[PDB]
Amino acid sequence: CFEPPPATTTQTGFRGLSMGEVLHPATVKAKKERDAQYPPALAAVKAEGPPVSQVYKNVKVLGNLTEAEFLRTMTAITEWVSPQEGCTYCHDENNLASEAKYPYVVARRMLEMTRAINTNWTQHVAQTGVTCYTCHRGTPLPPYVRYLEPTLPLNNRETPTHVERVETRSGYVVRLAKYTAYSALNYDPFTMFLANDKRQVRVVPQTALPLVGVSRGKERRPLSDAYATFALMMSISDSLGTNCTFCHNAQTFESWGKKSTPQRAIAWWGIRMVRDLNMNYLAPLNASLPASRLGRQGEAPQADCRTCHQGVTKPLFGASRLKDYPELGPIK
Amino acid sequence: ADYQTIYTQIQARGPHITVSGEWGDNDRVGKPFYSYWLGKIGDAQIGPIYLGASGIAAFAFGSTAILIILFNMAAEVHFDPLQFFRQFFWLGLYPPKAQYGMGIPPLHDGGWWLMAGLFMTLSLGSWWIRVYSRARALGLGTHIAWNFAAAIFFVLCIGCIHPTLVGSWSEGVPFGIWPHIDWLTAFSIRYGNFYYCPWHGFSIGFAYGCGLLFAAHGATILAVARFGGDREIEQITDRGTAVERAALFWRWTIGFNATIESVHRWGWFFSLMVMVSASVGILLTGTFVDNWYLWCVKHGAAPDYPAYLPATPDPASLPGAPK
Amino acid sequence: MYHGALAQHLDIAQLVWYAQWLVIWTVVLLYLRREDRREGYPLVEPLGLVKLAPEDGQVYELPYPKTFVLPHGGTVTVPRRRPETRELKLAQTDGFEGAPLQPTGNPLVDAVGPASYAERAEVVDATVDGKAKIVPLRVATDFSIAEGDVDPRGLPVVAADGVEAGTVTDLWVDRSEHYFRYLELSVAGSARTALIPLGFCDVKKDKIVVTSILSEQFANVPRLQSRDQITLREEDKVSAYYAGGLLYATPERAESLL
Amino acid sequence: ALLSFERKYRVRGGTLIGGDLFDFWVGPYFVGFFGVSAIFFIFLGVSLIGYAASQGPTWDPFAISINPPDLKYGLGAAPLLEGGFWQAITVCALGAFISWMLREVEISRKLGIGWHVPLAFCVPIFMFCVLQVFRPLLLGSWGHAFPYGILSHLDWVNNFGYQYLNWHYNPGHMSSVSFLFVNAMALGLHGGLILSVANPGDGDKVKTAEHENQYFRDVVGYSIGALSIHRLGLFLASNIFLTGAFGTIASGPFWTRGWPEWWGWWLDIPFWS
Ligand code: BCB
Ligand code: BCB
Ligand code: BCB
Ligand SMILES: C/C=C1/c2cc3[nH]c4c(c3C)C(=O)[C@H](C(=O)OC)c4c3nc(cc4[nH]c(cc(n2)[C@@H]1C)c(C(C)=O)c4C)[C@@H](C)[C@@H]3CCC(=O)OC/C=C(/C)CCC[C@H](C)CCC[C@@H](C)CCCC(C)C
Ligand SMILES: C/C=C1/c2cc3[nH]c4c(c3C)C(=O)[C@H](C(=O)OC)c4c3nc(cc4[nH]c(cc(n2)[C@@H]1C)c(C(C)=O)c4C)[C@@H](C)[C@@H]3CCC(=O)OC/C=C(/C)CCC[C@H](C)CCC[C@H](C)CCCC(C)C
Ligand SMILES: CC(C)=CCC/C(C)=C/CC/C(C)=C/CC/C(C)=C/CC/C(C)=C/CC/C(C)=C/CC/C(C)=C/CC1=C(C)C(=O)c2ccccc2C1=O
Ligand code: HEM
Ligand code: HEM
Ligand code: HEM
Ligand code: HEM
Ligand SMILES: CC(C)=CCC/C(C)=C/C=C/C(C)=C/C=C/C(C)=C/C=C\C=C(C)\C=C\C=C(/C)CC/C=C(\C)CCCC(C)C
Ligand SMILES: COC1=C(OC)C(=O)C(C/C=C(\C)CCC=C(C)C)=C(C)C1=O
Ligand SMILES: CCCCCCCCCCCC[N+](C)(C)[O-]
């Protein structure tokens, strides 16, 4: 229960403020390797030939690609989402234009969703962007997802113990704790702040004195919001494998400017993008997904910071395939 | 090297002494037994112990309080004995999560917490009577009771006075190892960093000071134990070379000194000030200050630093940004 | 509008901030420091030609005399005039007052420096009920050594110079605290007993080591009026004796170590 | 100039170095060689703080701040304006603290009393070293130390804690906080007790040791006793930093995750997982 030195440390604030990352080399190496599994881009192909919109029958998203380019996309998709399953995971051996299998439908929504991410959320994913791999990391079901209830293990590739199962009520507190960096924070930040945009993350007053008319009785927000916020922050820190000072100068959390690091702004955009994704792409999918995938509330697995980041401040240590697969965005 | 200061080389035993109180003497239950090891670094005699109505009322209420809490914790782990023991630190009894203002909250959302707090309070009150009475009964000054009163007062402050002032129970401190601790951050975060609350600083000053005073007072006495320094009472009524040297040690060191009696007043005061200070800090928080940091900036106190990484504009204030 | 906000860009917290420091300093300077002065004041300094008058500052620093009504009759009022009547066998080593004094005779007997004792009451510290507080076991019948701990009675007392100096005759116990404070030993060579504060004793199984003083010096240890009683002043004379040994036991004990 | 009972104690000797040379007083202050070196270091230190401060922005005491160097300067010296001043002042602080302590030793010897005080004073000096010297050494850079500033340093503390999501969960911290609180309470109970005995109120008689013990046995069924509470005090006090030092040093060199996750060792024991 103790990691041996030395520790890698970065600086992210003015000298003397103790702001920065504290990384355990080994742990970083363990993750650098895991992410290095990112399949390399497939050799570029000649754009020769007409658009697949003419060639194939049921192509509603990659119709502008040429046949060769299109198949290259399909290979990449397979390699990122279902390498073990192969093409048949979404197709009918005898009818590639068939939509019989649900993964086909969802994959289409996912193609759009990805294109969206790389196009409408560049303020977050920047020029790195994302591909099916970023989330799926090689399996139809992304290792890190969320239901309207905390679930254990965080990585669904692992098998839960009895208490970890959402069925075991006596395991609720621990399920939650592990979603908030092991804190006893009695709040589920994901549903509260990431499932949709109904709640406000900020809770600190922007004035020195209490403004009359919002500072008494039922006018004021309950302290619980401060906890909820704290929780969301704990999980965000954990999801990126980093600490508060990576974005804040604890001297004044609520303050921006010199009190915040660029990353915080990015994080800000991350929250919006995650909400967009969940609300408009993932959440609805509960209609196309077999009841087998749904949660106890019939919800579809949704994304959060960890879904892509998986313990790293930059998904896959900033690896990118954007230039290699322009079909995934940005779309001009 | 006065080893007597480290532990008692030769322990002693003798008839169990007893001082009669103005009352309650017949209420001292228990048979004084001795502990050899205890006696090595303290007084070997354990017990008896005064009961009285206050003491009993105290246990009565305290227990009721503790029971309400555990049952709720137990209920959290669905009464699974193994998880209860496993997840103990993470379990707690929370104040209302929703906003009901000062309205009494539902049992499942603040109601139980409120009751536990009521019984804990009564329990504290009874024990205060105990700490007070015993003093009068034994014909002693009520100094301890007052210092203890400050402590009970502070608890009341973070417990219900503050919540009352701003008008919301949700502000209360939850019962639980980790939980009552998580409150410290949620509370500080809400009021814009407690490090910028002058009273927080004052309180810390006295706490740290109590550390400095006991380390110093304690080391002082041991350093003059060879002369009887430990027999402080008669050192007061009749100054002896012990306290003379204790005094000269400090005067020659820091330029001024105290008396064997005054140093206790200093220490008493400091102790008291830790609680008094924090009570004020809490009474002021939420009531007349909403963000201690901005409050410091306003009064030109808060320090500022150059940016290291580029200053970052609040994304939410940029033109055409999502909500 | 703002809660706490007042007129001239000032708020409640800000006023309390000032009040706080006000109260603090008030208590610290006006109360505490006054109390720190109930002993040793008014200060002392050498006079010469004309200098006779109350001296303003000396009346302001002192607090009102408080009176302690003692548990076994009597009273003590502080602060008060408690000048060192004793003649000190000390002499100036140079000019200014900051100059240290020097023992002209034998510091241990003279009772100067570390060997100095306070002019405490020449009375026997009592127990909650008039009995002598500090008494030898030969009297403290119902008191005994805890089973498991050494019984120095009989064991020899070795001094700093390594050499038997006497035999532990008895143990003086505090009947109020149930704590052994002194060890009574027979001074080998000079028929007479002497007390030694336990604190100066390294209680072994076969011997009692006493590094404070040398074997010889054990003869000059102050004597008690009674044999089964001791007065506060005597406790000081006795304790003080050994303490002075720490610096005067030998010549080098007073010089610079490293 | 002298307390009424001070004359007889002002003898020569008890020094550690210098002998008669610096064995004298100046007002109530005993000098000694270490008193001298203390002044030297205090002088040097305050001077450096003034120059550094002046080369800085404001003069408001609450906002002044002398900071260590960026982490990139590692354990080497940094240019005065960017850490060197901090380095110099730190060394001065140390010279001053140690000098102050050794000076208490001389004073103790002269008075023929125990060196308990200066020993107790080592704890805080030790903790200072932990924060400024040792942890920085283990992490490999002076940049990890705390800045010398009335509010500045609170900020460093603040971010430091937050580098571990919730420093409250740090076991060394929990231990330490506990001792801070217990010690604070004990001093209140101790000081309170003494005063309660010598100051019963009205015309009441000053009480006794018997009454002391009777009080706590009556209240909590036990009484550690006179001399013992003083030993307990020094103990409780000293353990604020002694145990806390472990929580501080552990953070970073021996633990890089958040502190709440550390308790996973318990929460994740297989049999009840
Ligand atoms: C690990 C955590 C740290 C911490 C956490 C901390 C907190 C959380 C708080 C303080 C507070 C305070 N701190 Mg800091 N601190 C301070 C000094 C101070 C005081 C300004 C103030 C009250 C302390 C007190 O009452 O002491 C006990 C009692 C007495 C009587 C000490 C002497 C008097 C004292 C009031 C001030 C003495 C220091 C001077 C201002 C320095 C002047 C230097 C000049 C002479 C060269 C020093 C000198 C050091 C050293 C030498 O390392 C230090 C280290 C640290 N503090 C650690 C880095 N400190 C409180 C504050 O108000 O911040 C502004 C506060 O809220
Ligand atoms: C991230 C959050 C922060 C935080 C949040 C915080 C809050 C929210 C509050 C404090 C407060 C205080 N903090 Mg701060 N804090 C402190 C030090 C202190 C204390 C001096 C002071 C409270 C005094 C106390 O002893 O409470 C412990 C003593 C208590 C609680 C007394 C209890 C007495 C009672 C009679 C006991 C009863 C026992 C029982 C009978 C059991 C009953 C059981 C039931 C179930 C029956 C330091 C030294 C530091 C450092 C080094 O960083 C720091 C940093 C911070 N604090 C962070 C910035 N702090 C208080 C304050 O001063 O505010 C102005 C306060 O309200
Ligand atoms: C958000 C961050 C937090 C935090 C972060 C934190 C850190 C990062 C550290 C502590 C540490 C400590 N904290 Mg914590 N803290 C504490 C309490 C404590 C202390 C017990 C302990 C003391 C360390 C220290 O002061 O050395 C500093 C004091 C020193 C070095 C004294 C130096 C004195 C010097 C030798 C001489 C100075 C002389 C002057 C210059 C002379 C002036 C002359 C004039 C007067 C004539 C409480 C009670 C609370 C509450 C109630 O919430 C709390 C909350 C929190 N702390 C926050 C959660 N705290 C430390 C610890 O022990 O780790 C567990 C530590 O490293
Ligand atoms: C700066 C000054 C401070 C200060 C001062 C002072 N502090 C005092 C005094 C002064 C002056 C006293 O005179 C009084 C005392 O007496 O001292 C001997 C006391 C006290 N400070 C305690 C705890 C404390 N102080 C803290 C803090 C500070 N203190 C600050 C620092 C903290 C912190 C740090 O959190 C803690 C935890 C208690 C031990 C003690 C009485 C509590 C009580 O009121 O008891 C309440 C009574 C009970 C009977 C408990 C009931 C339940 C029991 C345990 C049984 C278990 C349940 C079980 C039976 C259920 C199942 C069985 C079934 C049959 C039912
Ligand atoms: C666990 C046990 C504890 C403990 C114990 C004891 N405490 C002692 C003794 C014992 C036993 C003494 O005998 C000695 C003393 O004589 O008492 C009267 C002393 C003393 N404890 C002081 C401060 C104190 N104790 C703290 C903490 C604890 N104490 C803990 C709690 C804290 C905290 C809480 O932060 C503070 C601030 C001084 C008042 C006093 C002289 C120090 C000195 O060194 O003189 C040396 C003299 C100087 C004039 C200062 C030199 C200034 C340098 C050169 C320049 C400044 C550098 C600096 C780093 C800048 C800071 C910036 C910013 C952070 C502001
Ligand atoms: C003139 C000159 C510059 C000359 C050169 C020589 C020289 C080296 C001089 C020293 C100059 C310096 C640096 C002075 C600074 C003095 C300092 C360090 C002051 C700090 C004072 C502070 C803030 C102390 C904190 C503790 C505090 C709140 C104390 C108040 C209560 C007192 C007086 C406590 C000490 C004290 C204790 C602890 C007892 O137990 C005890 C028991 C019995 C009798 C007396 C006492 C007693 O006096
Ligand atoms: C595996 C290497 C693989 C191949 C080969 C493949 C081919 C393929 C074709 C020829 C079509 C067009 C058929 C038509 O007329 O509509 C096509 C279309 C889609 N595919 Fe595919 N496909 C392979 C693998 C996969 C995998 C693993 C998935 C599901 C994750 C998948 C999905 C889809 C989707 C969706 C389309 C529609 C494209 C659009 O623009 O709407 N394929 N595939
Ligand atoms: C990239 C274009 C891409 C593809 C292709 C893709 C496919 C895909 C399928 C076929 C499923 C169905 C899995 C199942 O059978 O249950 C699916 C589901 C989810 N995906 Fe996906 N996905 C692509 C990209 C992305 C990206 C960038 C993310 C993460 C932001 C993401 C997330 C998810 C999630 C969550 C689901 C829902 C849970 C599930 O059905 O497994 N996908 N994806
Ligand atoms: C680490 C546990 C941590 C803390 C502590 C923390 C706190 C915090 C608070 C109190 C807020 C609300 C402040 C207000 O009311 O304005 C807040 C807000 C944001 N944070 Fe944070 N935060 C911690 C860590 C992190 C990390 C590691 C990042 C950056 C990757 C981050 C980011 C943000 C963002 C963005 C916001 C604003 C969100 C919004 O919707 O406006 N935080 N944080
Ligand atoms: C969830 C709300 C969330 C947070 C928080 C978050 C933060 C974040 C930061 C702080 C960065 C900047 C990293 C840096 O070191 O500069 C960053 C970068 C990227 N993110 Fe992110 N992120 C959150 C969620 C998500 C999700 C759901 C995805 C995948 C759809 C995702 C992706 C990315 C990508 C890509 C980057 C790369 C940017 C780069 O500089 O390389 N994030 N995120
Ligand atoms: C009158 C009306 C209408 C309503 C009531 C109003 C009223 C006065 C309410 C008061 C509320 C108050 C004062 C609330 C305060 C709550 C506070 C300060 C709680 C803080 C911490 C609680 C903690 C740590 C307790 C949690 C753990 C337990 C329940 C288990 C029991 C304790 C242990 C086993 C640990 C013992 C450790 C050691 C002492 C031996
Ligand atoms: C001379 O002074 C004192 C004693 O001697 C008679 C005591 O006996 C006690 C009481 C001590 C007890 C019960 C043990 C320690 C308690 C805690 C909470 C750590 C105190 C406070 C004291 O001041
Ligand atoms: C910041 C917390 C409160 C600190 C209070 C410090 C009191 C120090 C008392 C110094 C007394 C000085 N003297 C003798 C010159 O009066």
Ligand SMILES: [Fe+2]
């Ligand atoms: Fe004392």
